[PDB]
Write a protein that binds this ligand. Structure first.
Ligand SMILES: *[C@@H]1O[C@H](CO)[C@@H](O[C@@H]2O[C@H](CO)[C@@H](O[C@@H]3O[C@H](CO)[C@@H](O)[C@H](O)[C@@H]3O)[C@H](O)[C@H]2NC(C)=O)[C@H](O)[C@H]1NC(C)=O
Ligand SMILES: *[C@@H]1O[C@H](CO)[C@@H](O[C@@H]2O[C@H](CO)[C@@H](O)[C@H](O)[C@H]2NC(C)=O)[C@H](O)[C@H]1NC(C)=O
Ligand SMILES: CC(=O)N[C@@H]1[C@@H](O)[C@H](O)[C@@H](CO)O[C@H]1O
Ligand SMILES: *[C@@H]1O[C@H](CO)[C@@H](O)[C@H](O)[C@H]1NC(C)=O
Ligand SMILES: *[C@@H]1O[C@H](CO)[C@@H](O)[C@H](O)[C@H]1NC(C)=O
Length: 1310
């Protein structure tokens, strides 16, 4: 019959408004027929559950593109039937029959197929339905993800094999992109391509189902004979599972879960799997709370300067004049004010209104945009003459991107128009993938997709010359930019967004997939907002690999200074090479995200239970299931439900394998199943990420007596959930970068630990913390919890000193910028806590970052543990704003103002010079202005050559504090009293490199008058800031050692080398900070540089946290040297406290270990010494912290509403609240404004400051009653700085105790 590939299935059509699911089938073979036999259209009203008979398929008629179903049952209007009408248009896919509108007794349907396309050029041989419908009649349509040219590569860890699926139809093999997808057999859909040979694995049998939770399933199966020899007697079949990505489920590429026979199994988390948008509206410009769909038909009424501002459709017998969405009509209708009006070609006088612009319905049904009119005229039956218009997503349209309406198939005075246009052409959800392929090696940028979660997108820092008018750059890596805080009112279908006071700006669109370029991943956004000359804003995010660093943000590296181009650069982790990694003790170490998935929280000792109709599976992660029916070492065991006969599905296995957000536990061997091959029963459980699913229930899915395959929606199979330690101040626009204080696994381990002493050996609560991540594995305290409180279980036994648990909080917020230029970082929703038990809740962790522009070392200090809020205090370098700090003077030495690091490019001062071979242009080059091989100009021998010799140049460089250093040379000709030829060099970090050579990045010559600049970037080791270091190290016993003093060095630490033959060599050495710029050394980070013979053995890299030992002892090993007999190196510095401060002495040498014994006073454990009046005597340095010069004034601090007077070391004199007559010796007051200004008494005078590991805590206690029990204390923390004594109120801790930090000069050890 008509439309031959449309009979085999039953098609469903929802009307979202009324909730009436219409079930259609063309030739009338319906299985759900409670309605009449051979039912064409069976209306199922969902709330009355009525099954009305709308179509008799035996009375099916036809028109040019139009199936009518004219039933026998009479309408409540006489001589009318309950008609239905299915209009047929061309898509690229089979589609689904969307619901246009309906009066009481006709129902109109748009249905855009391949079956309507009678030009079958590259036709689909087998094409199944691709839509589902859950209980509430919400749509899972996936038609726009059907690739009609080529196949989606399915990401597995096998470099040799490659599966190539194509959703809901056979793979177009002929006109395809890849060389190995042309090899494919015809009519295949799964196409395993093994070693220049493509098998037909999957064939489309049945259209996709919704069987599970909300995830769709779709199964391909190949039946018959001629199975490959891979399958070992199984039919090849591929089941793809379509998941919708929420905040819980991350990915956007299809992943191969089970490759353990020709039964393949794919979890594909696509945005199209999500509930498809049904948003209709009144005249034009439909939009909803979901701001992904953007329609406006004003540009179909706002006609170009070209003539005939109305449209004309060329029709059957008589042509239709029409002007939609409030445009000037045709003069042939004269005076109708009709947005469409039909015109008779017999007589120009008989004109009938076919639509009016009072009654519209611009309906966006499931990607298929429709525009309906109503109440045109009366026709020959009694039907109001209405008219529909079906828009098509036709990009390169005629009439300057508007296109013309074609008329298709009038029924019952209802005119169906099809319209190829661009201003009704939406990408609603992303169809494009975010994986690439460097031939073999795959990548996945799905982690850094903030994917329609409506939780804030990324904010790009300005590393690059922002000016006065500096803006918020809101990128989103793989999606339309999320409409959230500070990004709402942005033009939607933008990927990067530029927003200011003046207005938001589109800054590129996700037009094309990512591409692997130049040893990184480029991500080019074309088609942005309009720049100067009708050029659109391009944007090139270069996502680079950095292992474990998901918490960074894109730096803005360059611009073009005319707003046509903005290049970003992201030192991320989700743009690093995917690899299979394997784990032994039920712990698999993720490499490309720096996570370590332990699944021992899933080991239930009493069994799990999966129940299908035929079997009961008792399965257990990383351990034997205890059920007496099965063999004892059973990892999994199916018992029947009728026979109750056991079969052992593989013996106990603790071997996990992680690849691309799924952990495969395979269980196999065990008990065979009575075949002459003696094939053992194996099963494979796939743990894959669901951030709020707990331990999870495993699921069984397959369809034969076969090798069994489970998936397990864990919470513990999940990476860090990148949350971007970056905060932009709203009122100023100062970005702060905490993304280098994120300590990640794979490195030397460690955490940000901070002790609390107070009372001896009880409430020694040693608090671990980590910034914007989960913790590292630290035994016993939680995973996915950023801070855990490890108390001591030590009864003074040297062996009996260990740590045990509390669980403080999970990083979801990211840093928030607080008052007085500090920034607060909340961890909400920890473990259940004890308090004043009026309300017990989850723990929180407040950590306040106040910045000291000191040295590279950073150690957190413990503020308070108060009413389920553990406070903290970051004295770091990274908490200060982003500064670029250009130096026009001497060039190959630059100091970072925040970190205090010195980038020296003196080993890049190559006296032979660097040759940059360019594009038919030789650039001879050197960085410190050395190379006189070219023109030695007036005081400019500065290495400026485009070869025959361009110029000698004036020199300047800048840093950014965020992975950007550039040297902006400028030649002697300032070109015609304008700007000059100023050609630029850029730095980035390759860790494993020598000093190196340039690679010639693009030159950009634009003679505006005389401007040109030739950028040539080069990867060197001397280019990026080392991560802030924890030079303070604990031991298991609780002695808190601190070597931060040994890293403050005026000259780098030498060593008395007097032992080994009394040689004339030196031995440079450091502690927890790399050695500075000793020439002829591997200076990326070096522990100790030996100097002799110009044979400079660089014999160790800096170990951040040294090894521990006995009472008052450390040991520090530098592990990664050079060139010694299958050993890199080792240098042991025994940091053994005596109480001199001598030089680390050369002890002896053997087996390429150079060993030193450092008698320092830094190697003594930190003791909290409590001081006298204002002074602390001999706190392990033998110095005195006399802070009475800060008691010479009333010190006013402020909050927003509150005010906090106090006075260091005695006797606050004036206030609003010296309102007492007692012995009150008031040294504080917390205040308010005029209303509710009964303001409270001090922390009373103590004249006692306690020394805490380099902070000085002064405690003013014994105020008035606060809420219930505690008194209104105040506390001052004195940290090192050059007396920026404008106090940081440490905001929103305990409401009964106020923390202050003074960045004062007297608190510094001299
Ligand atoms: C921003 O990213 C886009 C990527 O979409 C860059 O466009 C690409 O620019 C390169 C370099 O000229 C083009 O490569 C050329 O390819 C041809 C063959 O197609 C080859 O014969 C040439 O030797 C050259 O390698 C590439 O075609 C082009 N891609 C486009 C336009 O889609 C753009 O240059 C980047 N902008 C930057 C870094 O400022
Ligand atoms: C959008 O529709 C237009 C108009 O039908 C298509 O443009 C035609 O394309 C064919 C094939 O290349 C050309 O032979 C015609 O000359 C084009 N028409 C005009 C007026 O120039 C266009 O191909 C459609 N785009 C898509 C993506 O389907
Ligand atoms: C850091 C700090 O403020 N410490 C103490 C606080 O715990 C106590 O309740 C009060 C009086 O001893 O104030 C002080
Ligand atoms: C269908 O409806 C039209 C309009 O009333 C009528 O003229 C035609 O005869 C009908 N045909 C069938 C088969 O029901
Ligand atoms: C480079 O330095 C010159 C100094 O004359 C300056 O005019 C120019 O703006 C600087 N930057 C660039 C990108 O050329």
């Amino acid at each position: 019959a008509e439309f031959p590939e449309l009979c085999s299935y039953t098609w469903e059509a929802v009307d979202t408004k009324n909730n009436m699911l219409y079930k259609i089938n063309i030739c009338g073979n319906m299985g759900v027929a409670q309605c009449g036999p051979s039912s064409a259209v069976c209306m199922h009203d969902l709330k009355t559950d009525s099954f009305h008979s709308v179509g008799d398929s035996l009375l099916k008629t036809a028109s040019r593109s139009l199936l009518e179903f004219n039933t026998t049952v009479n309408c409540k209007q006489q001589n009318h039937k309950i008609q239905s009408s299915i209009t047929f248009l061309c898509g690229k896919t089979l589609g689904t029959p969307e619901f246009v509108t309906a009066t009481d007794c006709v129902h109109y349907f748009e249905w855009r197929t391949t079956a309507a396309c009678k030009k079958n050029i590259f036709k689909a041989n087998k094409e199944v339905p691709c839509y589902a419908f859950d209980r509430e009649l919400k749509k899972h349509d996936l038609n726009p993800l059907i690739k009609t040219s080529g196949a989606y590569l399915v990401d597995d860890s096998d470099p040799d094999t490659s599966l190539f699926i194509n959703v809901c139809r056979d793979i177009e093999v002929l006109r395809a992109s890849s060389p190995q997808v042309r090899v494919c057999p015809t009519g295949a859909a799964a196409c395993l391509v093994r070693g220049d040979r493509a098998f037909d694995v999957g064939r489309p049998q049945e259209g996709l189902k919704l069987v599970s939770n909300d995830r769709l399933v779709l199964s391909y199966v190949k039946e018959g004979a001629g199975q490959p020899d891979f399958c070992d007697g199984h039919s090849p079949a591929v089941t793809i599972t379509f998941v919708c990505p929420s905040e819980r489920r991350e990915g956007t590429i299809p992943k191969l879960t089970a490759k353990s026979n020709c039964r393949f199994e794919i979890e594909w988390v696509t945005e199209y799997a999500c509930h498809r948008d049904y948003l209709e509206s009144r005249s034009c410009s439909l939009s909803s709370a979901q701001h992904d769909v953007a329609v406006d038909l004003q540009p179909l009424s706002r006609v170009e300067a070209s003539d005939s501002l109305f449209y004309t459709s060329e029709a059957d017998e008589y042509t239709y004049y029409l002007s939609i969405c409030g445009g000037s009509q045709a003069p042939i209708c004269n005076k109708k004010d009709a947005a469409v009006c039909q015109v008779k070609k017999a007589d120009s006088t008989q004109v009938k209104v076919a639509g009016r612009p009072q009654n519209l319905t611009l309906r966006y049904s499931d990607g298929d945009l429709t525009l309906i009119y109503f109440g045109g005229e009366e026709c020959s039956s009694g039907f109001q003459r209405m008219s529909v218009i079906n828009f098509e997503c036709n990009q390169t349209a005629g009439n300057n991107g508007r296109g013309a309406p074609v008329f298709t198939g009038e029924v019952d005075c209802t005119y169906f128009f099809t319209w190829d246009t661009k201003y009704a052409c939406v990408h609603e959800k992303e169809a494009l993938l975010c994986g690439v392929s460097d031939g073999k090696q795959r990548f996945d940028l799905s982690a850094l997709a903030r994917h329609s979660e409506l939780e804030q997108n990324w904010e790009a820092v300005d590393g690059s010359q922002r000016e006065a008018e500096k803006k918020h750059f809101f990128i989103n890596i793989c999606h339309r930019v999320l409409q959230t805080g500070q990004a709402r009112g942005c033009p939607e279908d933008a990927a990067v967004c530029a927003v200011d006071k003046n207005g938001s700006k589109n800054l590129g669109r996700f037009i094309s997939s990512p591409t692997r370029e130049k040893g990184n991943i480029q991500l080019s956004y074309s088609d942005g907002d309009e720049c100067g000359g009708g050029q659109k804003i391009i944007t090139n995010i270069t996502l680079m690999c950095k292992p474990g660093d998901l918490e960074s943000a894109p730096v803005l590296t360059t611009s073009r200074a005319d707003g046509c181009f903005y290049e970003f650069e992201w030192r991320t982790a989700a743009a690093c090479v995917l690899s299979r990694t394997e784990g032994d003790n039920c712990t698999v170490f993720d490499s490309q995200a720096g996570f370590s998935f332990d699944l021992t929280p899933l080991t239930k000792k009493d069994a799990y239970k999966v129940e299908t109709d035929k079997y009961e599976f008792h399965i257990n992660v990383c351990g034997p299931v205890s059920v007496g029916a099965c063999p004892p070492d059973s990892g999994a065991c199916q018992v029947s439900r009728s026979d109750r006969k056991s079969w052992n599905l593989g013996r106990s296995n603790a071997k996990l394998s992680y690849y691309d957000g799924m952990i495969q536990l395979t269980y196999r061997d065990g008990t065979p199943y009575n075949n002459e091959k003696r094939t053992p029963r194996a099963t494979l459980i796939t743990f894959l990420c669901d951030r709020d699913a707990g331990v999870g229930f495993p699921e069984y899915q397959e369809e034969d007596n076969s090798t069994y395959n489970f998936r397990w929606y864990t919470s513990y199979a999940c990476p860090e959930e990148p949350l971007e330690c970056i905060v932009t101040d709203p009122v100023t626009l100062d970005q702060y970068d905490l993304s280098r204080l994120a300590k990640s696994e794979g490195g030397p381990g460690g955490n940000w630990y901070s002790l609390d002493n107070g009372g001896a050996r009880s409430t020694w609560r040693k608090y671990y913390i980590n910034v914007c991540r989960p913790l590292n594995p630290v035994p016993g305290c939680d995973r996915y919890a950023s801070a855990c409180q490890m108390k001591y279980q030590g009864e003074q036994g040297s062996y009996s000193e260990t740590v045990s648990i509390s669980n403080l909080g999970v990083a979801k917020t990211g840093p928030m910028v607080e008052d007085s230029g500090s920034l607060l970082l909340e961890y909400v929703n920890g473990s259940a806590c004890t308090t004043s038990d009026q309300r017990r809740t989850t723990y929180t962790t407040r950590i306040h970052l106040v910045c000291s522009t000191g040295s590279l070392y950073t150690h957190p200090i413990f503020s308070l543990n108060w009413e389920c809020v553990v406070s903290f205090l970051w004295n770091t370098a990274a908490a200060c704003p982003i500064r670029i700090t250009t130096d026009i003077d001497q060039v190959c030495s630059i100091k970072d103002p925040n970190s205090g690091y010195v980038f020296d490019l003196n080993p890049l001062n190559n006296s032979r010079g660097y040759v940059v071979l360019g594009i038919g242009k030789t650039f001879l080059f050197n960085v410190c202005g050395d190379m006189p091989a070219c023109g030695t100009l007036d005081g400019k021998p500065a290495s400026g050559c485009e070869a025959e010799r361009l110029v000698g140049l004036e020199k300047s460089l800048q840093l950014s504090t965020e992975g950007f250093i550039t040297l902006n040379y400028t030649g002697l000709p300032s070109h015609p009293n304008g700007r000059a030829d100023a050609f630029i060099i850029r730095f980035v970090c390759n860790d494993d490199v020598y000093p190196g050579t340039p690679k010639f990045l693009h030159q950009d010559i634009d003679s505006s008058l005389g401007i040109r600049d030739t950028f040539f970037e080069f990867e060197t080791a001397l280019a990026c800031v080392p991560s802030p270091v924890d030079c303070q190290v604990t031991d298991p016993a609780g002695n808190e050692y601190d070597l931060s003093g040994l890293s403050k060095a005026r000259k780098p630490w030498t060593a008395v080398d007097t032992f080994d033959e009394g040689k004339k060599r030196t031995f440079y050495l450091s502690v927890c900070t790399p050695l500075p710029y000793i020439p002829g050394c591997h200076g990326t980070a070096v522990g100790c540089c030996l100097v002799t013979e110009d044979s400079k053995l660089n014999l160790g890299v800096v170990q951040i946290s040294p090894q521990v030992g006995a009472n008052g002892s450390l040991s520090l090993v530098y592990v990664n040297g050079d060139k010694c007999k299958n050993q890199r190196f080792s240098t042991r510095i025994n940091l053994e406290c005596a109480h001199t401060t001598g030089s680390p002495t050369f002890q002896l040498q053997n087996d390429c270990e150079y060993v030193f014994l450092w008698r320092t006073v830094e190697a003594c454990p930190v003791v909290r010494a409590e001081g006298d009046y204002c002074e602390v005597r001999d706190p392990r340095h033998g110095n005195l912290y006399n802070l009475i010069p800060l008691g010479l004034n009333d010190t006013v601090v402020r909050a927003g509403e509150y005010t906090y007077y106090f006075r260091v070391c005695g006797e606050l004199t004036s206030g609003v609240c010296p309102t007492s007559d007692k012995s009150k010796v008031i040294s504080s007051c917390q205040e308010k404004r005029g209303p509710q200004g009964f303001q409270k008494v001090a922390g009373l005078f103590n004249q006692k400051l306690t020394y805490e590991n380099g902070v000085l805590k002064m405690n003013y206690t014994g105020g008035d009653t606060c809420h219930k029990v505690y008194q209104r204390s105040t506390t001052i923390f004195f940290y090192c700085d050059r007396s920026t004594q404008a106090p940081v109120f440490l905001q929103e801790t305990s409401d009964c105790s106020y923390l202050f930090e003074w960045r004062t000069q007297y608190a510094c050890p001299p």
